[PDB]
Design an enzyme around this catalytic site. Structure first.
Site, PDB file in Angstrom:
ATOM      1  N   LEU A   1      74.584  13.134  37.261  1.00  0.00           N
ATOM      2  CA  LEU A   1      74.787  13.432  35.840  1.00  0.00           C
ATOM      3  C   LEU A   1      73.890  14.605  35.403  1.00  0.00           C
ATOM      4  O   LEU A   1      72.720  14.668  35.789  1.00  0.00           O
ATOM      5  CB  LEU A   1      74.514  12.155  35.006  1.00  0.00           C
TER       6      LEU A   1
ATOM      7  N   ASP B   1      53.117  60.272  26.788  1.00  0.00           N
ATOM      8  CA  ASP B   1      51.931  60.168  27.623  1.00  0.00           C
ATOM      9  C   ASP B   1      52.224  59.666  29.032  1.00  0.00           C
ATOM     10  O   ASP B   1      51.596  58.712  29.498  1.00  0.00           O
ATOM     11  CB  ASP B   1      50.873  59.292  26.916  1.00  0.00           C
TER      12      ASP B   1
END
Ligand SMILES: N#Cc1cccc(Cn2cc(NC(=O)c3n[nH]c4cc(-c5cn[nH]c5)ccc34)cn2)c1
Length: 239
Positions: A21, A120
């Site tokens: 299940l 940068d």
């Protein structure tokens, strides 16, 4: 990888197949993150989160309930590339170093296609993760700056290409400082006169040709990251 029951929380049944299940549940995960502290920035966050690539450090979200305002990022196991190369100087094969440039180039090609300009691009803004992978950070000084940037602050993907050329030099020199004993004004003088960073021993003649191509005076002469990616990927495969 084993999960302890405490971490798991069952909710509801979501049917069953043939063997066992199945249930819907919540799994409480305590994951490592890098937290960067400080209308204006809330706009930037969702846009940065849309930028998804395996070679870019990922933004997970922003925490702003109260000061200091902070950003939640992907954790990069081995820190900045500059320190990584410096502490491991001599422990690098020319293929690992090429592989590092290709990693950066992939994320850069994506940012170029997205029309996002890094301001940068340097080894210090690149980070090392699992299995020496390199990812780009801080996207959205004169030593990595192209003529237009130190002279007129004219940023573009081609200025990012210049920065990548300097990054490639940092990688193949194993984290050495570009223009080491020169000042912000001395660097400007040398580049304008046409002089460039020397060919490191670990870099092949073809790799240095790529570096000088990134270092052309005219930005339109420099190749796009899309062009740089196909070239580096060929050298990385053929050897
Ligand atoms: N466990 C553990 C542990 C503890 C201490 C040091 C290290 C090694 N180390 C790892 C980093 N990682 C990062 O610094 C880092 N990891 N992800 C980052 C994202 C940004 C960033 C800045 N602007 N945009 C992104 C900046 C830095 C990072 C630094 N040292 C690992």
């Amino acid at each position: 990888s084993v999960i302890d029951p405490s971490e798991l929380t069952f909710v509801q049944e979501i049917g069953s197949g043939q063997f066992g299940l199945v249930h819907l549940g919540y799994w409480l995960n305590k994951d490592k993150v890098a937290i960067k502290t400080i209308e204006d920035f809330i706009e930037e966050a969702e846009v940065m989160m849309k930028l998804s690539h395996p070679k870019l450090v990922q933004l997970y979200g922003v925490c702003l309930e109260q000061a200091p305002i902070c950003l939640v990022f992907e954790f990069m196991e081995h820190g900045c590339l500059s320190d990584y190369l410096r502490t491991q100087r001599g422990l690098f094969a020319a293929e690992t170093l090429l592989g590092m440039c290709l990693d950066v180039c992939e994320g850069m090609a994506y940012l170029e296609e997205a029309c996002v300009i890094h301001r940068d691009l340097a080894a210090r803004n690149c980070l090392v993760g699992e299995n020496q992978v390199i990812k780009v950070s801080d996207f959205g000084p004169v030593k990595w700056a192209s003529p237009e940037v130190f002279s007129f602050s004219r940023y573009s993907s081609k200025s990012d290409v210049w920065s990548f050329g300097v990054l490639m030099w940092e990688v193949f020199s194993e984290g050495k400082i570009p223009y080491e004993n020169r000042s912000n004004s001395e660097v400007v003088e040398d580049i304008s006169t046409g002089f460039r960073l020397y060919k490191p021993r670990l870099a092949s003649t073809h790799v240095y040709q790529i570096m000088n191509h990134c270092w052309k005076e005219r930005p339109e002469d420099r190749p796009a990251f899309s062009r740089l990616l196909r070239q580096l990927a060929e050298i990385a495969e053929s050897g």
